[PDB]
C-alpha cells in the first residue's frame, strides 16, 4: 500500500464564523489526483505532493469532519485521519470560573465550572497555549441537563501560566461551537516569602473615599496581584522600586461602595516567576454606611472620668446585628470587634476599658454589621469624646 | 396508566421537596440519599411503564401504522428516562461543587440549582403529557 | 321670656344624600314669623304655631346646625337649641367587625371595630332601633390615623336584638358622613340546653361534595343559627318540627372549597326568644385536597396478619407536616389525629392497633395536615387494605 | 438644625424596627414599652425643634411678613407632633385589638397594622420635609 495520506489545515482547526481557512493534504510524489471527502457530504470539498483546499469564509456548512485521499497510477489510496474542522463563532459565551479560588497551592488540585443559561450543551475546556484535544465532558458524561459541566484541572505546577476559554456545542452538531468564554488565569501560590498589604485610608472606609491599598515586599518582586476573596479575577500591578530591594504597588481601587468591601490578599511575583509567593495578611476593607439600622455609643460611668476608674463603653441597638465594632478617631488599627449580647430589649457590646489612662481619651464612634457580609458596616454612631482626668 | 402514573406522582413530589432547598434538604444533598431515592423512584416509574405497555400490547386488535406508533412510544419513554437521569445528575453536579467548594455552599450556587431545577421539572411535564396522549392513541 | 321655640326634622337628622326632608319649628300661638338661621350660613333656609321648611333634595349644602326663632308682637324669642341635619349618603362605606365573635355571652362585653383604607375619618356607630345620639370616637378619641375606630360595646342584655352600622365623616365636614356600613348582628348566647350538630356526608370531604349540617334539639327551638368560628355573619334557618318536639334545620352549604373547611357549632332560639341557647360540640369539618404535598400508608407487621397479633399503621411524608389523620372506609367518627415524629428522613405518626381483631379489617387512608389551617388537609394515602385471619 | 434632625432620625428608625413586626416587637406592642419609647423619641424631637426655633429666631435681622412666616413654621411644628401622635395611637389600638381578640394577634390584623403603619411613616416624611424648608426660608 502507498503511504496514507496526511490532512491538516492552517491556521488551525478551530475556525471562527467568517474566518477563512485551507485545508492541506500530503500524498505521495507521482500522485495524479487529490480528493478531499466530507463525512456526511458526497461533494468533495472545492478541489504533486501538496494539494491545497481553500475556504473563503468559514461557515456552518463547512464544520465537519473531513478525510482525503489521492488517485495513483496504481489506484486509490487509503482514507486520510479525519480532521474535525470547527466553526466557533455561533453561539452565545458561557461562563468559566474557578472553585474554590482563582488562586491554588502549587501541585495542587481544583475545579473549573462551566456554565451556560439554557440547557442542552456538551462543553469544551480548551488551555490557552496548549496544543490538546479540545477537553469534553462526554468522557466524564454526566445526565445533568446541559447547564454546566465541572472540568476538574491538576496538578497545578508552575512551570507555566494556566489560561483557560470554555466553548459549548449542541450534539446534533458537534462540530459547531459557541463563542469563547472570558479567559480565567490560574495563580500558583507557592512558598516564597510573602509581602506585606497595607491600606493608605484608615480602617472604616465611607462611601466616596479613595482606597488605596499598597502591596509591598522586601524581597524584590517584581509583579503583584491583589485578591479580594470571592471574585473570579484579580488585579497585577509591577512593583517599582523607591529603594533597591524594596518593591512596591499602589493598588489605587478608586472611590469606594459596596463592592470593594472585603478580604484582600497580596501575591508577589517576578517577570519569569509564573508561580507567586505566599499570600499577604488579610486585609479586611471595612464599608460604612450599607445598613440604614442604626447603633448607639453610650459611657459608663461616663464621658467624664479620673483616671483609674473603670470606663465601660457600651454600643447598643434595637436591632439584631450580630458584631458591634469601635472606632477611635486617630488610631490607624483594625476596629474592635466584639460579638452582641441581647440585655434590656437592646442588643449590646461592653467596651471595657480599665483602668483608663491618659490614652484612652478621645472621641469614640461605634459600628454594627451582620455575618451575611461581616464588611458593610452601619453609619457611625454619634461621636462620645471620653475625657479622662489626673 | 394509574399506576405508572402513581409513581411519576411520587417522583415528582420529591422533586418538589428538594426544590424548596431547605435545611435538612441542603444536608442530605451532600450525602447522597436525595438521589438515591429519586434514581429508587424513577426505576419502579420506568419497570412500570414497561408492564403498561406490554400490557396494552396485548389489548391491541396497519402494520406499517401500528409499528410506527410503537416507536412513538419508546421515543416518548426515552425522553422521560433521560429527563429523570437529567434532574439526578444535576443533584450529583451540585453535591460536587459544594465539595469543590471546600464543604461552604452560597446562596448563589443554590439559586442557580433551583433555577437549572424548574427547568428541567417542565421538561419532565411535558414529556409526560406526550406519552400519556401516545399510550391514549396507542 | 316667651318659651323657646323648638326644632324637629322628619323624618329624622340622618337623611341620605338625595332623599327629602322637611325640619318644623313650634313657637308661640301668636307668633308672627319664624326665621330658621344656619350656623354659618346667614341667609335664612327656605321660608300660626307650627312652621315648616322643605328640603327637596338633600344635599352637602343643607348639611349643618340650624337654629330656630319666631318673631312675637313683643319682640324676638330665644334661639332654638341646635338642630345637626347630617347627610349620610357620600363617602365610601366602611367595615364593622366584633371582636372576637359576633356571638357573645349574655350580659358580656365586646368590641367593634369600624374602619376605612383611607386615614383623617371620625367614626359613629348606630344601634339600630335605638334614638341615640350618634356615638363618635371623640368622646374617647385617640391619635391615631383615622384608619379604625374601635366601639366597646356592652353589657350585651338579650331584651333585644343588638344590629349595628358604622358611618365616618371628616372633621371639616363634620354634618356629612359616608355610607353605611352592612350591619352587623350581635347574638346574646346564654344557658339554656345546647343544640346539636351533625354532618350527614362524612368525616374528610372532598372538593365538589354537598356539605349539610343538620341541626337539632329536643328542647323545641323555633329557629337556628350556624357560626363558623373566625367569620363576620352567620346563617339563619327556622326550625321544622319532624316529630313533636324535635326540631331540626338543615344547614345546605352547598358545594364544598376551602372556606368550608372549620370549626362549626350551632345555637338555637325562638321567634320570640332574642337570647341564644349555649353552644352545640363543635363540628370540625376537615377538608381534604387543600395540599399538594403528599402522605404515604404502610402497615407494620403487615397488610395481611392474623387476630391477635401487634398491627401499627405509620402514616409518614417528607413533608414537615405538623399532624397526621387516620381514615378508615365505612367509618363515621372523626378521623384519629396524631402528631407527627421525625425519624429516618421522613416524619410519621404510628397508629397502634394492637391486638388486632376481627373489627380491625377494611381500608384505610392517611392524611396529613399544617396547623396553620388544621381543617385543610392533603389528599388521601394510597388505600391499605388490613386483612385480619382468625 | 441638625440636633431636632437627629432626634427625628431616632424615632424614625425605631419607627423601622416596629415595622418589621417581628416577635420580639410583637410582644413589646403587648406590653406598652414600644409606645412609650416612641412617645419619648417624640418629646425629645419637639423639644429639641423649640429650642432651634428660639435661637434662629435671634438670628433674625416686614413685620407681616415675619408673622406669616413664624405661623407657618409653627403650623408645620404641630403637624409633626400630630403625625408621631397619630402613629402612637395606632400601636396603642393594636394592643386593644390583640385583647380584645383575647390575647391572639391574627396575620390579617398584622398585614393592616403595616399598611397603616407605611401609610403613617409618608406623611410623617413629608410633613418633616416641608418643616426642613419652612426653616430654610426663615
Keep these: 500500500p502507498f503511504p496514507k495520506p496526511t490532512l491538516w489545515a492552517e491556521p488551525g482547526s478551530v475556525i471562527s464564523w467568517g474566518s477563512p481557512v485551507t485545508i492541506w493534504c500530503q500524498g505521495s510524489l507521482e500522485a495524479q489526483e487529490y480528493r478531499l471527502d466530507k463525512e456526511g457530504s458526497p461533494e468533495p470539498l472545492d478541489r504533486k505532493n501538496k494539494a491545497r483546499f481553500s475556504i473563503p469564509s468559514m461557515t456552518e456548512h463547512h464544520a465537519g469532519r473531513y478525510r482525503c485521499h489521492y488517485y495513483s497510477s496504481a489506484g486509490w489510496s487509503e482514507p486520510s485521519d479525519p480532521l474535525e474542522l470547527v466553526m466557533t463563532g455561533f453561539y452565545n459565551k458561557p461562563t468559566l470560573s474557578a472553585l474554590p479560588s482563582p488562586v491554588v497551592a502549587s501541585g495542587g488540585n481544583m475545579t473549573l465550572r462551566c456554565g451556560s443559561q439554557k440547557g442542552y450543551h456538551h462543553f469544551v475546556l480548551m488551555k490557552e497555549g496548549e496544543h490538546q484535544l479540545p477537553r469534553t465532558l462526554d468522557s466524564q458524561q454526566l445526565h445533568s441537563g446541559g447547564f454546566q459541566a465541572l472540568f476538574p ?27 469563547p468564554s472570558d479567559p480565567l488565569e490560574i495563580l500558583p501560590s507557592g512558598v516564597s516569602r510573602k509581602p506585606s498589604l497595607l491600606t493608605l485610608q484608615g480602617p472604616v472606609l465611607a462611601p466616596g473615599q479613595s482606597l488605596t491599598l499598597q502591596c509591598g515586599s522586601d524581597v524584590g518582586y517584581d509583579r503583584f496581584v491583589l485578591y479580594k476573596e470571592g471574585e473570579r479575577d484579580f488585579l497585577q500591578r509591577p512593583g517599582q522600586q523607591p529603594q533597591a530591594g524594596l518593591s512596591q504597588a499602589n493598588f489605587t481601587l478608586g472611590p469606594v461602595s459596596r463592592s470593594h468591601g472585603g478580604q484582600y490578599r497580596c501575591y508577589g511575583a517576578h517577570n ?62 483594625p476596629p474592635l470587634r466584639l460579638r452582641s449580647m441581647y440585655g434590656a430589649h437592646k442588643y449590646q ?29 452601619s453609619f457611625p454612631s454619634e461621636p462620645l469624646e471620653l475625657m479622662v482626668s489626673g | 396508566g394509574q399506576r405508572w402514573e402513581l409513581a411519576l406522582g411520587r417522583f415528582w413530589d420529591y422533586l418538589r421537596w428538594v426544590q424548596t432547598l431547605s435545611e435538612q434538604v441542603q444536608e442530605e444533598l451532600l450525602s447522597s440519599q436525595v438521589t438515591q431515592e429519586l434514581r429508587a423512584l424513577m ?37 422521560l428516562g433521560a429527563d429523570m437521569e437529567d434532574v439526578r445528575g444535576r443533584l450529583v453536579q451540585y453535591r460536587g461543587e459544594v465539595q469543590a467548594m471546600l464543604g461552604q455552599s452560597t446562596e448563589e450556587l443554590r439559586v442557580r440549582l433551583a433555577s437549572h431545577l424548574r427547568k428541567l421539572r417542565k421538561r419532565l411535564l411535558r414529556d409526560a403529557d406526550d406519552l400519556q396522549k401516545r399510550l391514549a392513541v396507542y
Tied chains: 1, 3.
Excluded at chain 1, 457590646?349 to 458596616?377: D, I
Design chain 1, 349 to 377: 457590646a461592653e467596651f471595657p476599658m480599665s483602668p483608663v489612662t491618659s490614652a484612652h481619651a478621645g472621641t469614640y464612634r461605634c459600628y454594627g454589621s451582620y455575618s451575611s457580609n461581616p464588611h458593610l458596616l
Design chain 1, 272 to 333: 519569569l516567576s509564573s508561580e507567586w509567593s505566599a499570600p499577604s495578611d488579610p486585609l479586611n476593607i471595612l464599608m460604612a454606611g450599607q445598613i440604614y439600622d442604626t447603633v448607639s455609643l453610650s459611657a459608663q460611668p461616663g464621658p467624664t472620668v479620673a483616671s483609674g476608674e473603670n470606663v465601660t463603653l457600651l454600643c447598643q441597638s434595637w436591632w439584631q446585628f450580630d458584631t458591634f465594632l469601635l472606632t477611635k478617631e486617630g488610631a490607624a488599627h
Design chain 2, 43 to 79: 426505576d419502579e416509574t420506568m419497570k412500570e411503564l414497561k408492564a403498561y405497555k406490554s400490557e396494552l400490547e396485548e389489548q391491541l386488535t396497519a402494520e406499517e401504522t401500528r409499528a410506527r406508533l410503537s416507536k412513538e412510544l419508546q421515543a416518548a419513554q426515552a425522553r
Design chain 1, 153 to 179: 484541572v491538576g496538578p497545578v505546577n508552575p512551570s507555566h501560566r494556566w489560561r483557560f476559554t470554555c466553548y459549548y456545542y449542541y450534539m446534533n452538531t458537534p462540530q459547531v461551537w459557541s463563542h
